């Protein structure tokens, strides 16, 4: 028997976690004695795109760290991946429900974790490309794993950025310049990436203060096909997302080294991991 | 009796000829006898919708065209008030969109560059009345004659303030990008010098007899990607920063595609003038 290795006949469906346009993440219970007692587990799945869920699964299966969400196995016949369940969700969900618990001093330490992940990543010579709220999941009060690599490319050896061609469906709020400009992905635009997570986790992630919200508040709501051609426009004005309410000046300057115009001045993860433990000392 | 008020109880609604987002152009007759006798007019109104506001826009737009008076300009008739419909001549060619498909055969070089003269001596006097125009495309050049086009709708045109080279655009919800100069799809500022770019692609498509499989859209589109959504601007943009432009028409030969070119100058300031595209093409035609 390989640990690995789930059997769809055993596999049962609870529900949906999410889903985008090609396939989903489903609540199973691998339940191979059929009494209900078996582990949750987090499933994802294609709809009824092939080989980059392959790509994704190997990526997974060769990280480990305590802020990546354990990769379990897959089930094959088309394949599913199958990852550790962590039923306290995202940022998203679960931020807005636990005000009252997380603290400023929990938030860094949260910030801390998302940069040490990431470094790891970065480390391997991946570019995530996807990095939000949505996308780190809360282990516990004190631990957040990042919980999806669905957007995750190596970067060559010698290089230092991946080129994207895929680029309908891009979190354009969210994205560096350099990626919204000319779809080229460094090191750097995870760096970038973070800052906005960072935005959103200081304003537990409330929906009027979404990055997206406040970029379209700057630019218009109206827009349309023109939104990525303003939102460049207004970063390169040298505009940034405002201060969240309650946040110490200091915490407001460390996120805005993450959003310098050139990738090549932008803060490093190790330099964001030094800021923060000096704020928490 | 003014000559220049329509009743509506006369003006009978053929069928559409156009369709916006906001507004229609219809086919309508008017028939104070009662005996369908009476004139064929294009009337222009807005949908029941209207709001940030369409009514203020088409009084203006009204207001432009009936002091507009060029050979190459369609011909104001009146207005409709009951919501206000700006009524046109009909020309019944329509476009060259839909003329220059059909009409190959007649329709040869030497028609092609005097249509381009017309069409520029038209551009040249909405400028010289402060105009930016902002939406020239084969599908706003009409068909009066073999002989004669005229440019046929004003509905995104804007005065350029006194002492001042642009207009800057706010409701850009709706834009033709694929005739767009740079400065227009980056910060959404209109000078004389981005219609004589949007002159440069109407010229490309005259050349090409409008055929769909050549259009502007379809040639950026195979350059750039027909996938992208959202991005597709941003890629525009990027490829023509590379100094990349619409191919050659089959055909055309390089003196004309050279006029073409110097519409299609990266920096408005760098770019030929109407006046001068006049001159460049009346020395081909000799
Ligand atoms: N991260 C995170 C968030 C997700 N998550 C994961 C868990 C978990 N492991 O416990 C979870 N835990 C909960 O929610 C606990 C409160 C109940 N949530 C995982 C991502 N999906 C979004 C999505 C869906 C499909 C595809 C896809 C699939 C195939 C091809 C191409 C794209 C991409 C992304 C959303 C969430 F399911
Ligand atoms: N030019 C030109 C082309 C048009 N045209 C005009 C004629 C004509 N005069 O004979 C015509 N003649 C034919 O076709 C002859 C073959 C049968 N065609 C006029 C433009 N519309 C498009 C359109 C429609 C509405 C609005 C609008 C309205 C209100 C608010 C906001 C926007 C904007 C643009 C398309 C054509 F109708």
């Known amino acids: ?32 004695e059929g009494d209900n007692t078996g582990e949750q587990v987090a499933v994802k799945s294609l709809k009824p795109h092939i080989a980059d869920l392959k790509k994704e699964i190997e990526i997974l299966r060769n990280l480990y760290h305590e802020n990546i969400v354990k990769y379990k196995g897959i089930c094959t016949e088309g394949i599913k991946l ?21 603290n400023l001093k929990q ?33 516990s009060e004190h ?6 690599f669905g957007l995750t490319k190596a970067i060559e050896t010698d290089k230092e950025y991946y080129t994207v061609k895929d680029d309908r469906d891009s979190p354009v709020f969210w994205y560096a310049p350099e990626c919204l400009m000319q779809s080229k992905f460094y090191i750097a ?38 939104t990525v051609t303003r939102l460049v426009n207004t970063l390169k004005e040298g505009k940034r997302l405002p201060c969240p309410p309650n946040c110490p000046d200091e915490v407001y300057q460390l996120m805005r080294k993450c959003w310098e115009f050139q990738p090549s001045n932008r803060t490093s993860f190790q330099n964001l991991i030094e800021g923060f433990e000096a704020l928490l000392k």
């Open 107 to 139: 938030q860094l330490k949260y910030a801390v974790q998302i940069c040490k992940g990431m470094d790891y990543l970065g480390s391997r010579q991946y570019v995530h490309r996807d990095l939000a709220a949505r996308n780190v999941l809360v282990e």
């Open 1 to 32: 028997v390989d640990p690995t290795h789930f059997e769809k006949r055993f596999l049962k469906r609870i529900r949906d976690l999410g889903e985008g346009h090609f396939g989903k993440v489903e609540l199973c219970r691998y339940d191979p």
């Open 143 to 148: 631990q957040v794993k990042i919980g999806d």
């Open 189 to 226: 635009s995870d760096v970038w990436s973070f800052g906005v997570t960072l935005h959103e986790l200081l304003t537990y992630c409330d929906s009027d203060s979404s990055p997206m919200a406040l970029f379209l508040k700057m630019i218009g709501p109206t827009h349309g096909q023109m």
């Open 82 to 102: 199958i990852m550790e369940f962590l039923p306290s969700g995202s940022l998203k969900e679960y931020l807005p429900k636990n005000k009252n618990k997380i």
